[PDB]
């Protein structure tokens, strides 16, 4: 939840396998994690 | 009618570099009006804008003449959540 | 003695700080280089500003920071993990304050800290740490789609 720009900063420190876990946490996180720049 | 400049800082959580914009204002105009004009130009609602001139935080209900904001002066603006 | 600058927290408290400590905040350092009064700080209260001043005196000899890039998280110095052994609200309040005052070094460690609180846990174990509710048929669809990826 909370603010989106805060969470993308932390998400950018996560591997592909770490990011794999976060799209099942909540609905808003799943939408946030479909940004292709995170899997760079 | 008069022209003033508003300059941002670097905001890393957004991806914004410092930059300056121009506004058309009146000395009578309230800080609430100027924030409304800033939303008009860049889409930032007032609840996320803090404007500063001469190391004084500009309060919403007051005017630019109350801070002696004149032609070509420059306000700085921090973005908050 | 020392050249000093005055900061005013958002709740109104004055802090007097060394120039070299305060200039670690690029926002503070920038609004001093355009032309006695205390510098207003946006939505940084006294309690969070107190933490920020602690971090900046420790890092006062750090150079101006360079742009990134590849981001790791095993590299948080020992002093900054002990400094951030803090309640989680202030941790986020510190992310915001580092953003508003443009202190790259503190924005990096704090975001990495939260990321270590995610690395390895699972959606249930993560939800309980930041009290986020799970919004059974929906979950199975994403669980299948993101199985092959990672």
UniProtKB/Swiss-Prot annotation, chain A:
Q: Tell where it localizes.
A: Nucleus, Nucleolus; Nucleus; Chromosome
Residue span(s) of domain F-box:
1-40
Q: Where are the transmembrane segments?
A: none
Q: What is the effect of changing residue 6 to A?
A: Decreased ininteraction with UBB
Highest taxon listed in the record's lineage:
Eukaryota
State the family named in the UniProt similarity comment for this chain.
Belongs to the JHDM1 histone demethylase family.
Function of the molecule: Histone demethylase that demethylates 'Lys-4' and 'Lys-36' of histone H3, thereby playing a central role in histone code. Preferentially demethylates trimethylated H3 'Lys-4' and dimethylated H3 'Lys-36' residue while it has weak or no activity for mono- and tri-methylated H3 'Lys-36'. Preferentially binds the transcribed region of ribosomal RNA and represses the transcription of ribosomal RNA genes which inhibits cell growth and proliferation. May also serve as a substrate-recognition component of the SCF (SKP1-CUL1-F-box protein)-type E3 ubiquitin ligase complex.
Written domain comment of the UniProt record: The LRR repeats are required for the interaction with the PCGF1-BCORL1 heterodimeric complex.
**Subunit-structure text:** Interacts with SKP1, forming heterodimers. The heterodimeric KDM2B-SKP1 complex interacts with the PCGF1-BCORL1 heterodimeric complex to form a homotetrameric polycomb repression complex 1 (PRC1.1). Directly interacts with CUL1. The SKP1-KDM2B complex interacts with UBB.
The name on file for this protein is: Lysine-specific demethylase 2B
Taxonomy of origin reads: Eukaryota, Metazoa, Chordata, Craniata, Vertebrata
Curated annotation (Swiss-Prot), chain B:
Q: What residues does the Ubiquitin-like domain cover? A: 2-78
Provide the topology term for how it sits in the membrane: Peripheral membrane protein
Share the record's PTM remark: Phosphorylated ubiquitin specifically binds and activates parkin (PRKN), triggering mitophagy. Phosphorylation does not affect E1-mediated E2 charging of ubiquitin but affects discharging of E2 enzymes to form polyubiquitin chains. It also affects deubiquitination by deubiquitinase enzymes such as USP30. Mono-ADP-ribosylated at the C-terminus by PARP9, a component of the PPAR9-DTX3L complex. ADP-ribosylation requires processing by E1 and E2 enzymes and prevents ubiquitin conjugation to substrates such as histones.
Which superkingdom? Eukaryota
Q: Subcellular localization, per the record?
A: Cytoplasm; Nucleus; Mitochondrion outer membrane
State its role. Answer: Exists either covalently attached to another protein, or free (unanchored). When covalently bound, it is conjugated to target proteins via an isopeptide bond either as a monomer (monoubiquitin), a polymer linked via different Lys residues of the ubiquitin (polyubiquitin chains) or a linear polymer linked via the initiator Met of the ubiquitin (linear polyubiquitin chains).
Listed name of the protein: Ubiquitin
Organism annotation: Homo sapiens (Human)
Lineage, highest ranks first: Eukaryota, Metazoa, Chordata, Craniata, Vertebrata
UniProtKB/Swiss-Prot annotation, chain C:
The function of this protein is: Essential component of the SCF (SKP1-CUL1-F-box protein) ubiquitin ligase complex, which mediates the ubiquitination of proteins involved in cell cycle progression, signal transduction and transcription. In the SCF complex, serves as an adapter that links the F-box protein to CUL1. The functional specificity of the SCF complex depends on the F-box protein as substrate recognition component. SCF(BTRC) and SCF(FBXW11) direct ubiquitination of CTNNB1 and participate in Wnt signaling. SCF(FBXW11) directs ubiquitination of phosphorylated NFKBIA.
Q: Which GO terms fall under molecular function for this chain's record?
A: beta-catenin binding; cullin family protein binding; F-box domain binding; molecular function activator activity; protein domain specific binding; ubiquitin ligase complex scaffold activity; ubiquitin-like ligase-substrate adaptor activity
Q: Which Pfam families does the protein's record reference? A: Skp1, Skp1_POZ
> Which CDD domains does the record associate with it?
BTB_POZ_SKP1
Region: Interaction with the F-box domain of F-box proteins, residue numbers = 95-150
| UniProt organism field | Homo sapiens
Membrane-spanning intervals of the chain: none
Cellular-component GO terms for this entry: centrosome; Cul7-RING ubiquitin ligase complex; cytoplasm; cytosol; nucleoplasm; nucleus; PcG protein complex; SCF ubiquitin ligase complex
Q: What is this protein called?
A: S-phase kinase-associated protein 1
Q: Name the pathway it acts in.
A: Protein modification; protein ubiquitination
PANTHER family named in the record: SKP1 (PTHR11165)
The record's subunit annotation is: Interacts with KDM2B, forming heterodimers. The KDM2B-SKP1 heterodimeric complex interacts with the PCGF1-BCORL heterodimeric complex to form a homotetrameric polycomb repression complex 1 (PRC1.1). Component of multiple SCF (SKP1-CUL1-F-box) E3 ubiquitin-protein ligase complexes formed of CUL1, SKP1, RBX1 and a variable F-box domain-containing protein as substrate-specific subunit. Component of the SCF(FBXW11) complex containing FBXW11. Component of the SCF(SKP2) complex containing SKP2, in which it interacts directly with SKP1, SKP2 and RBX1.
Which residues, renumbered to this chain, carry the PTM Phosphothreonine? 122
Q: Spell out the residue ranges making up region: Disordered.
A: 57-74
- Provide the disulphide bond pattern: none
Whether Phosphoprotein counts among this entry's keywords is: yes
Ubl conjugation: is it a keyword of this entry? yes
């Amino acid at each position: 939840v909370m603010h989106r720009e805060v969470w993308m900063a932390v998400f950018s420190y996560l591997s592909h396998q770490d990011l794999c876990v976060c799209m099942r946490v909540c609905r808003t996180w799943n939408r946030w994690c479909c940004d292709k720049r995170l899997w760079t | 009618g008069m022209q003033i400049f508003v300059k941002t800082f670097r905001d890393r959580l957004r991806n914004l570099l410092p930059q300056t914009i121009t506004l058309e204002v009146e000395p009578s105009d309230t800080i609430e009006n100027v924030k409304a004009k800033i939303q008009d130009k860049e889409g930032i609602p007032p609840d996320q804008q803090v404007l500063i001139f001469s190391r004084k935080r500009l309060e919403d209900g007051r005017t630019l003449s109350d801070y002696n904001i004149q032609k070509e002066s420059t306000l700085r603006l921090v973005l908050v959540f | 003695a020392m050249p000093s600058i005055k900061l005013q927290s958002s709740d109104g408290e004055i802090f007097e700080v060394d120039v070299e400590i305060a200039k670690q905040s690029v926002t503070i350092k920038t609004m001093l280089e355009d032309l006695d009064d205390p510098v207003p700080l946006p939505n940084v209260n006294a309690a969070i500003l107190k933490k920020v001043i602690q971090w900046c005196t420790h890092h006062k000899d750090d150079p101006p920071p360079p742009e990134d890039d590849e981001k790791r998280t095993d590299d948080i110095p020992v002093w900054d993990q002990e400094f951030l052994k803090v309640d989680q609200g202030t941790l986020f309040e510190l992310i915001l304050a580092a953003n508003y005052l443009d202190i790259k070094g503190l924005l990096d460690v704090t975001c990495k800290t939260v990321a270590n609180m995610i690395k390895g846990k699972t959606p249930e174990e993560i939800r309980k740490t930041f009290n986020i509710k799970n919004d059974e048929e929906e979950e199975a669809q994403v669980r299948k789609e993101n199985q092959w990826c990672e």
